[PDB]
């Protein structure tokens, strides 16, 4: 299983951007999917969690209100919308598949990130 | 309003017998058919017999045929529920229950429901917890806050209530539901977090608590050297 | 015997949400159908019968639907004292009820704090050894606990317990007690428990030395 993330880039304060994370050699359909974040000098700390559809999507306090996941599962693809992005927004995303299909967090396979920066 | 109250409930060993009550107030008793259900972790809700309001009729749930007994006193305004051969699958909170005014072609069910009574069937005997510490150190500390706590093991039957400086202390404190263990005795913690900055000046005491067997505990919980 | 089945089992709500769970028969009931509401600790409480039709005194918000073997209970707009448990049940032959749907206070994701605790000198003297992991005021209540005791798996010697959401935050907190003769505690060296939580980037171990404490 291969996840990769796309569409970070350089943003204004209040900017918007959609970070997409498609997953290959497994249909993703039956997973949770989840977006974490890391700054330089801090821990990856969790953002947001799409679970499969009907079961709902769960927010970080630090995003909620500005951040919306979502998913493509006909194109075994997750979403997370920013909006109203803040400079304490900036940091590297992840995408990370929840292996357990019961929601424990087993968090095996990993993508390799992509960069957002927020400022001017 | 319509109030139910039901008792007779309490802890007896399987094959013996348990007769519980209901005492209805509020209503014409003697105009209603009455339910007895029943709730239990493992079966949800589960209906258990029914008895018209002349005492003519009587049904009962399959799993209670030939044990169980619905009857009533209209001239008490009491419902009863005679129980024998109690197996340990009756373990429940067992409600009694109003069926409600419906007109004359339809089907009814249960409008007001009592607080239920407790019947508990077990081969276990009443005994108080044995406390132990759960003792803070560097396993249980992170940042400024450590957690520390008391362990409520093997006792029979529920409850047991959990104190802490003889409640003095009550910010950050989780009690956890007992779990029923393999060998029929509850055991439960309960824990508390605190200022790490405290540990081994401030004192920490659980105060246990089991009525049954008239059991207290006191046990201080010291910090250990990891 | 008329199996009722309702779905889901868990529904994390808000207030103001509009909100539809579904019961379903596995024959016909015509509209023979009545829910009910529970709290914890608390009788149930008539809320519709007749598939739709409001008991007295029931708020506007509620309402219910359904003929045949499809049912629905909606409330328009969620509100707090709605946060309980929904059973629905067929009164067309004898009564049976489903399994009930519980309405669940969601809120932001919180990560669990992790402590382990060893045995105390007192029970060893007894001949048992219990070991308790706590995870501490986590949200959602999905988590999973694993024992290893020399880095080896543990399986059917421990056991769990979860509290109620708390009344002031909505978290929820969890003790895992590992349980162990004190010949089989004496036989091994390190204890540990690891965490994972969908809060959690990588997994949480606590872990002693039997004799470091």
């Known amino acids: 299983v291969q996840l990769x993330x796309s569409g970070g880039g350089x943003v204004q304060x209040g900017x918007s951007l959609x970070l997409s994370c498609x997953a290959x050699x497994x249909x993703x359909x039956x997973x949770x999917x989840x977006w974490x974040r890391q700054x330089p000098g801090x821990x990856r700390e969790x953002v947001x969690x799409x679970x499969x559809x009907x079961x709902x999507x769960x927010x970080x306090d630090s995003x909620x209100g500005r951040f919306t996941x979502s998913x493509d599962x006909x194109x075994x693809x997750x979403x997370l919308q920013x909006x109203x992005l803040x400079x304490x927004d900036x940091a590297x995303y992840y995408c990370x598949x929840x292996x357990x299909x019961x929601x424990x967090x087993x968090x095996x396979x990993w993508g390799x990130g992509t960069x957002v920066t927020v400022s001017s | 309003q319509v109030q139910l109250v039901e008792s007779g409930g309490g802890v007896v060993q399987p094959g013996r017998s348990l007769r519980l009550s209901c005492a209805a107030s509020?209503?014409?008793?003697?105009?209603?058919?009455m339910h007895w259900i029943r709730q239990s972790p493992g079966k949800g809700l589960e209906w258990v017999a029914i008895?018209?309001?002349?005492?003519?009729?009587?049904y009962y749930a399959d799993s209670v045929k030939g044990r169980f007994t619905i009857s009533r006193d209209n001239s008490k305004n009491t419902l009863y529920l005679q129980m024998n051969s109690l197996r340990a699958e009756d373990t429940a909170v067992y409600y009694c229950?109003?069926?409600?005014?419906?007109?004359?072609?339809?089907?009814?069910?249960?409008?007001?429901w009592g607080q239920g009574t407790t019947v508990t069937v077990s081969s276990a005997s009443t005994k108080g917890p044995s406390v132990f510490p759960l003792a803070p150190s560097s396993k249980s500390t992170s940042g400024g806050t450590a957690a520390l706590g008391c362990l409520v093991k093997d006792y029979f039957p529920e409850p047991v209530t959990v104190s802490w400086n003889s409640g003095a202390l009550t910010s950050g404190v989780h009690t956890f539901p007992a779990v029923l263990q393999s060998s029929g005795l509850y055991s439960l913690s309960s824990v508390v977090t605190v200022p790490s900055s405290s540990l081994g000046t401030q004192t920490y005491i659980c105060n246990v608590n089991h009525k049954p067997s008239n059991t207290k505990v006191d046990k201080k919980v010291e910090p250990k050297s990891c | 015997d008329i199996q009722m089945t309702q779905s889901p089992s868990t529904l994390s709500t808000s207030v103001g949400d509009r909100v539809t769970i579904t019961c379903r028969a596995s024959?016909?009931?015509?509209?023979?159908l009545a829910w009910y509401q529970q709290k914890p600790g608390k009788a149930p409480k008539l809320l519709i019968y007749?598939?739709?039709t409001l008991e007295s005194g029931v708020p506007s918000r509620f309402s219910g639907s359904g003929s045949g073997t499809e049912f629905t209970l909606t409330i328009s707009s969620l509100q707090p004292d709605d946060f309980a448990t929904y059973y629905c049940?067929?009164?067309?032959?004898?009564?049976?009820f489903g399994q009930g749907t519980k309405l669940e206070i969601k809120r932001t994701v919180a990560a669990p704090s992790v402590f382990i605790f060893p045995p105390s000198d007192e029970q060893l003297k007894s001949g048992t050894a219990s070991v308790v992991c706590l995870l501490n005021n986590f949200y959602p209540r999905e988590a999973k606990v694993q024992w290893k005791v020399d880095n080896a798996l543990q399986s059917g010697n421990s056991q769990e317990s979860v509290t109620e959401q708390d009344s002031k935050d909505s978290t929820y907190s969890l003790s895992s007690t590992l349980t162990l003769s004190k010949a089989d505690y004496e036989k091994h060296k390190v204890y540990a428990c690891e965490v994972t939580h969908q809060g959690l980037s990588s997994p949480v171990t606590k872990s002693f030395n039997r004799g470091e404490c």
């Open positions: 229950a109003k069926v409600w005014f419906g007109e004359s072609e339809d089907n009814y069910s249960v409008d007001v």
């Open positions: 509020g209503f014409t008793f003697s105009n209603f058919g």
């Open positions: 008895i018209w309001y002349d005492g003519s009729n009587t």
């Open positions: 024959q016909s009931i015509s509209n023979w």
């Open positions: 007749k598939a739709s």
């Open positions: 049940q067929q009164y067309s032959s004898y009564w049976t």
